[PDB]
Design a binder for this molecule. Structure first.
Ligand SMILES: [Zn+2]
Ligand SMILES: [Zn+2]
Lengths: 48, 49, 138, 137, 114, 710, 181
């Protein structure tokens, strides 16, 4: 284990990335249909 | 002290001994980036050969 | 006036069958066609196939005027019916179904490049010089 | 004067005709009438700044059809003829387009399901046999 | 800045210079149809590409369900304190994160960009 | 009314109703039922009559007769076959296929005496269990247990030589849809993909490749010409320009050509970008020389110029975009669709749109048991017709008589179906090099969960990590957790719990409604008013435009939510930024059920939950719920343009404003997982690699698997 | 900014790839310029390869047979400032005129000047392409280009070809195959 695993277990999993960048825009410039269009916020782009 | 990343151009400009030293430095940089260490003897062997 | 509250009531009549078949034209407004030129007309068959299921031909003023070629629409009138309402002195509208709809396009009247000599300017695929004077050699 | 010549007297008179598209039930009723001489009445009402065109179905034919005008300057149309005597003639220039819509909003689809069922009546499906056929060979 | 086509054969028009009167002469070289052009411009290319996107945006984008919907920043021609904001999201046409406001009234459609 | 703080019971009640009505393997059974009902009939009907001569002989086909799966013993006894007997005796589970042969004789003497060879046996077609054309359909628990067949078994698997075989759905690129792509290293910069085919009856997918030329050869006059537009056409050995193809359809005036290409005449830069093609096409000004040019570069050049004319007309008529029309007069539809073809390419070239993503799994469809068996039956029915024709010609060259009883060979169709469903080589036996493998794997029976996973499985035709990645498009389409650990990561995936696959429908009622509802037809249009209106697409092909978008969409949605002439499977798309209406009807689409949010309240009221709570003795089920306009089948295509709510009581209500125009609500958030991933509890508390590992290992967990194991 | 590393870089080094994936070239300054930010910015601008595409705002082609015709609404000033001396005007001036303008932001940011690019145009080509020099007092840095005098393909083909030729590579300053520093 590592202290980063301790942080992910207890406090916050953290920012999550795909091929370096954040979660892309598979739909019409939105990550998921639940989130509003044209959003670059934390929750809408992959942060846990 | 000016160096590069490409090998064919540094062969065409400086010489094969510069290829030796630059190839040494680039292989050491790409292996020892993540903290994993490897002995110099194998690197020197591969760079000479 | 009377036109501010004008109400018109006419009668719709459909005769059962007519000895003369009716159809419809198709002209683009961007073609800028005039009807003062319409002094003598011809409408004959295409001869490229060599008849009812074959595309059309039309001539204007012989060879002096412009030329059209007619092609039948691809859709079938199994679920469509088009009627033409004609004004008559008796005041009752006439409703007549059309048989076919044909599409017409204008044709140029010049020395078009024939196919047997069209292969010589293909070696100049990118090497082509002076696009603006290809017609000058013809 | 030739067989292939097209008569152009209709265009010289500047005759104005209309183009109407109607749904299939109206055309089917007019075909069932078999040209009796009267199929309905067309009503045109003009206000101070608007035009209201509608069609009324005959009460004998049944046992409101509002008309919406469409822009004409997008493309020009005339009407020609082909006779049984092989004499081609031109009727006149189309000057207005008409679109027919039914007054029914939700009760139209009661008849539309029946029409789709009639259209899918010759749609052909495989049948299952309880007992295998033993009359072969 | 703009082009038009030939008249009597209905073909595409090509430029030509005139030897006598020294005026640009658009002409169809499938014909002999010659005329002058009042624009006096043949070719323009905005390489940095600062086109005006206000004519690019369809006036009916505001009635989209899944677009955002703000309450402030009212429209200009009508008050109508409700509007939609989004970005262009057009590839190769700049990199700006600047917002494109459209009024959401059914008969309005005046769009502004602040 | 409204149900606050009672969603936990209501959501699982309606999921109970869905799983009690449909089940888990409906994407197999419905597809096979559609194959048996429509597809074999359409294949046998859309076949060329056999004409041969001398007297003229004509053969035509008719409807399909099918019986229960029986056995042909050594004495000829037609005993009813049970699936247990099929498993024990290494016996294939099949029923004979019966047609009639209408033999009409023409001796040029008005001697037409047509003979109807009624109920002619032509071969054996396999049937998989628990389908409506099998013995296990309609049997209750007691009849299944008396028959030594497991009631818990979902079925959906064939029996070939006693081995249980299941068809895994294979994805393919979506038909009749124009795409844009940008190859990084190729000489073409951008390209357009419109792999297209007719309505799944006549001929397979024939592609068209419209593309770009990158800025090369700069400094010379090549850059002065600009970026010309080029395409490569099927069975044309090399590339060909665009306006010459447009003139090959009979439209010679380039004002009409650019009218088809450009819809708005106040766009100077796009006309500048399409201008390089106009300078290139200055050598061709007439239709016939264009046909002679395009026919001279085919696979087989003609002897005379009329031969190139005929070859080019045939290849531009019978094959060039078969879905839009092949009725010999459809050049106007082809011209409009070929204008829109590279209109999308120009829109991607100027950056007004973006490049379409290949692994976006809403831009591709799935080949189920239905389409794959239809393709196989098409191929070897063509083979059977060829065999019948050559035998008939050889035996009629003597001129004695003709007999249909021995001419038709059941052997070839029987071994074709059996072999291709057994060994996995999908296609002809002698053409196994070009035959796609991996189809029809041996059914896994280690675990009931493993069985339900193997029934509901997808696969990719890929032999680069781009297609393997989990995509945004999947939300409740395909399970994120389940993935094989080995070399097939991303390629092999299983369905979600509510992943319903489209079975297919005919678009004739769709066209019948759209023509009547104040829509101007495609041929009878003013071409200058295309840009102001909204385009209409039904199964990809352009059928006209409409000037009133939201009234049309609201009318279509109101028709679908009331189970009117439109099937609830059929989906419609509104892309406002492009002004198109895309309506999809064909099979292969994948869908999930979703709730309806009107204004700011759900339509799933307390009365529906009360009726579904006492489901039995009240004949109210999932099909009655969808008929009330409460649940609408929203697929991955409509998910591009709608909104979803995670939980009504937590998100749909009023708080600090995030949104107020929700259109759909999630039926329950835990239907994301598949069959394997559902049995993991608290999967959010785990790590996703561990969920993937256990979903892979959940199939290896032993136990009781099927109740009649002894 | 970052360079490639790991398994693809190891493959790139064990092989001898004639094109690298992400080649880089670390530059060390020798003397006074190592510690001065302004001299380092000068070396930055002197090593930045600047094509004419990046610096010019837009291009235009017009037709002016008369030098005093002045079809542009605001060009009359520098035309009258320069055209009182008829430098081979009477032979020909090629009425098909090229007009480009320079974006002031990209003009100032790259820290070059506008006379030297015209000098490089008339030096790298010679006397086969006439150049017209304007002033920086105007709000738009307009540049006017005309064809030579002593001489198929009309005029539009040659003019558009040479316009594209300036627009793709002139090497205004810097060294080739260097994208960003
Ligand atoms: Zn012309
Ligand atoms: Zn407003």
């Amino acid at each position: 284990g590592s202290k980063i695993n301790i942080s992910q277990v207890i406090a916050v999993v953290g920012q999550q990335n795909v091929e370096g960048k954040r979660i892309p825009f598979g739909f019409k410039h939105r990550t998921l249909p639940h989130f509003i269009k044209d959003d670059y916020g934390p929750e809408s782009r992959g942060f846990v | 002290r000016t160096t590069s990343n490409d090998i064919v151009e540094i062969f065409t400009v400086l010489g094969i001994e510069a290829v030796r030293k630059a190839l040494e430095r680039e292989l050491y940089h790409v292996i020892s980036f993540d903290g994993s260490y490897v002995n110099y003897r194998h690197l020197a062997l591969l760079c000479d050969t | 006036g009377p036109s501010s509250q004008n109400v018109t009531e006419y009668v719709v009549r459909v005769p059962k069958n007519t000895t003369k078949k009716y159809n419809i034209m198709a002209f683009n407004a961007a073609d800028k066609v005039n009807f003062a030129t319409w002094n003598q007309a011809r409408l004959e068959r295409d001869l490229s196939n060599k008849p009812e299921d074959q595309p059309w031909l039309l001539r204007v003023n012989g060879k002096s005027g412009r030329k059209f070629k007619g092609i039948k629409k691809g859709g079938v009138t199994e679920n469509t019916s088009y009627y033409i309402f004609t004004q008559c002195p008796d005041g009752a509208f006439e409703a007549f179904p059309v048989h076919n709809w044909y599409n017409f396009t204008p044709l140029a009247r010049h020395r078009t490049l024939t196919a047997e000599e069209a292969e010589e300017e293909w070696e100049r695929r990118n090497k082509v010089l002076n696009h603006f004077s290809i017609m000058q050699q013809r | 004067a030739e067989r292939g010549e097209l008569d152009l007297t209709g265009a010289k008179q500047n005759t104005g005709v209309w183009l109407v598209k109607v749904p299939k039930y109206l055309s089917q009723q007019w075909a069932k009438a078999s040209g009796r001489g009267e199929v309905g009445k067309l009503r045109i009402a003009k206000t101070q700044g608007r035009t209201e065109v509608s069609f009324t179905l005959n009460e004998d034919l049944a046992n409101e059809h509002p008309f919406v005008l469409q822009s004409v300057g997008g493309q020009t149309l005339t009407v020609f003829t082909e006779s049984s005597s092989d004499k081609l003639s031109l009727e006149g220039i189309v000057v207005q387009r008409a679109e027919c819509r039914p007054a029914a909003s939700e009760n139209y689809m009661r008849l539309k399901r029946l029409q789709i069922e009639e259209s899918s009546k010759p749609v052909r499906l495989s049948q299952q046999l309880d007992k295998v056929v033993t009359t072969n060979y | 800045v703009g082009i038009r086509f030939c008249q009597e054969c209905n073909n595409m028009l090509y430029p030509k210079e005139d030897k006598e009167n020294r005026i640009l002469l658009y002409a169809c070289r499938n014909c002999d149809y010659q005329q002058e052009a009042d624009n006096s411009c043949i070719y323009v290319n905005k390489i940095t590409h600062e086109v005006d996107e206000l004519t690019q945006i369809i006036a009916d984008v505001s009635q989209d369900p899944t677009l955002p919907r703000t309450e402030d920043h009212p429209c200009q021609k009508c008050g109508h304190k409700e509007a939609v904001f989004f970005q262009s999201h057009s590839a190769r046409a700049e990199d700006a994160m600047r917002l494109y406001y459209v009024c959401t009234a059914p008969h309005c459609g005046h769009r502004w960009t602040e | 009314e409204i149900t606050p703080d009672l969603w936990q019971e209501a959501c699982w009640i309606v999921i109970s109703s869905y799983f009690d009505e449909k089940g888990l393997v409906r994407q197999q059974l419905d597809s096979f039922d559609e194959f048996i009902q429509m597809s074999v009939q359409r294949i046998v009907e859309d076949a060329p009559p056999i004409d041969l001569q001398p007297p003229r002989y004509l053969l035509k086909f008719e409807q399909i007769y099918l019986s229960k799966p029986t056995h042909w013993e050594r004495d000829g006894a037609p005993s009813p076959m049970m699936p247990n007997e099929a498993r024990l005796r290494n016996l294939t589970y099949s029923a004979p296929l019966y047609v009639d042969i209408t033999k009409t004789v023409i001796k040029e003497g008005e001697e037409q005496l047509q003979t109807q060879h009624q109920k002619t046996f032509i071969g054996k077609i396999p049937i998989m269990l628990r389908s409506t054309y099998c013995l296990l359909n309609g049997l209750t628990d007691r009849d299944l247990c008396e028959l030594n067949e497991c009631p818990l078994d979902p079925g959906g698997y064939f029996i070939i030589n006693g081995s249980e075989k299941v068809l895994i759905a294979q994805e393919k690129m979506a038909t009749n849809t124009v795409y844009v792509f940008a190859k990084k290293d190729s000489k073409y910069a951008y390209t357009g993909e419109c792999r297209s085919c007719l309505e799944n009856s006549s001929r397979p997918t024939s592609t068209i490749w419209v593309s770009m030329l990158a800025r090369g050869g700069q400094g010379a006059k090549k850059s002065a010409i600009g970026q010309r537009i080029v395409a490569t056409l099927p069975y044309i050995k090399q590339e060909v320009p665009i306006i010459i193809v447009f003139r090959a359809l009979g439209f010679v005036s380039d004002r009409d050509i650019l009218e088809h290409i450009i819809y708005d005449f106040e766009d100077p830069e796009m006309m500048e970008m399409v201008k390089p093609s106009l300078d290139e096409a200055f050598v061709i000004q007439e239709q016939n020389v264009a046909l002679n040019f395009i026919g001279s570069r085919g696979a087989k050049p003609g002897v005379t110029k009329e031969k190139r004319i005929k070859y080019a007309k045939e290849v531009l008529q019978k094959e060039m975009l078969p879905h839009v029309g092949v009725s010999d007069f459809c050049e106007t539809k082809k011209a409009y669709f070929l204008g829109y073809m590279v209109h999308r390419l120009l829109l991607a070239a100027l950056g007004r749109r973006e490049l379409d993503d290949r692994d976006h799994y809403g831009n591709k469809r799935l080949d189920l048991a239905g389409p794959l068996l239809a393709f196989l039956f098409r191929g070897m029915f063509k083979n059977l017709l060829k065999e019948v024709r050559i035998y008939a010609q050889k035996f009629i060259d003597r001129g004695k008589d003709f007999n249909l009883e021995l001419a038709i060979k059941t052997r070839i169709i029987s071994d074709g179906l059996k072999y291709s469903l057994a060994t996995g080589n999908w296609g002809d036996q002698k053409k196994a090099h070009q035959a796609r493998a991996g189809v029809s794997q041996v059914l896994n029976r280690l675990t009931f969960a493993s069985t339900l996973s193997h029934l509901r499985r997808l696969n990719s035709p890929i032999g680069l990590a781009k297609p393997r990645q989990l995509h945004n498009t999947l939300w409740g389409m395909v399970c994120p957790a389940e993935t094989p650990e080995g070399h097939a990561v991303g390629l092999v995936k299983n369905l979600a719990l509510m992943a319903y696959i489209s079975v297919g429908s005919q678009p004739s009622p769709i066209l019948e409604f759209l023509e009547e509802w104040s829509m101007e037809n495609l041929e009878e249009i003013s071409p200058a008013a295309i840009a102001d209106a909204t385009k209409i697409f039904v199964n990809g092909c352009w059928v006209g435009i409409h000037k009133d978008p939201e009234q049309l969409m609201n009318t279509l949605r109101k028709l679908r939510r009331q189970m009117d002439i439109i099937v609830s499977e059929v989906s419609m798309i509104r892309d406002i930024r492009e002004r198109e209406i895309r309506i999809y009807t064909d099979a292969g689409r994948i869908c999930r059920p979703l709730l309806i949010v009107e204004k700011q309240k759900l339509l799933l009221k307390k009365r529906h939950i009360d009726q579904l709570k006492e489901r039995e003795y009240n004949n109210y089920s999932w099909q009655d719920l969808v008929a009330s306009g409460v649940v609408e089948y929203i697929d991955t295509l409509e998910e591009e343009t709608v909104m979803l709510a995670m939980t009504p009581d937590d998100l749909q209500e009023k708080e600090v404003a995030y949104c107020s125009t929700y259109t759909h609500c999630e039926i329950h958030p835990s239907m994301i997982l598949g069959v394997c991933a559902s049995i993991i509890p608290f999967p959010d508390h785990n790590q996703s690699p561990r969920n993937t590992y256990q979903s892979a290992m959940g199939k290896q967990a032993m136990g009781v698997y099927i109740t009649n194991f002894h | 900014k970052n360079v490639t590393l790991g398994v693809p870089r190891l493959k790139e080094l064990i092989n001898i790839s004639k094109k690298p994936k992400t080649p880089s070239l670390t530059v060390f300054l020798l003397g006074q310029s190592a510690r001065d930010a302004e001299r380092a910015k000068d070396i930055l601008c002197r090593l930045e390869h600047t094509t004419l595409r990046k610096v010019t705002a837009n291009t235009a082609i017009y037709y002016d047979p008369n030098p005093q015709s002045t079809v542009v609404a605001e060009d009359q000033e520098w035309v009258n400032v320069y055209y009182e001396m008829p430098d081979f005007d009477v032979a020909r001036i090629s009425p098909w005129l090229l007009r480009v303008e320079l974006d002031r932001k990209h003009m100032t940011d790259r820290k070059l000047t506008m006379e030297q690019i015209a000098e490089k145009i008339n030096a790298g080509f010679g006397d086969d392409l006439n150049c017209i020099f304007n002033d920086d007092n105007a709000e738009k840095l307009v540049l006017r280009i005309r064809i030579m005098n002593s001489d198929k393909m009309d005029d539009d083909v040659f003019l558009r070809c040479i316009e594209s030729n300036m627009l793709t590579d002139m090497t205004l300053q810097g060294i080739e195959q260097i994208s960003k520093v």
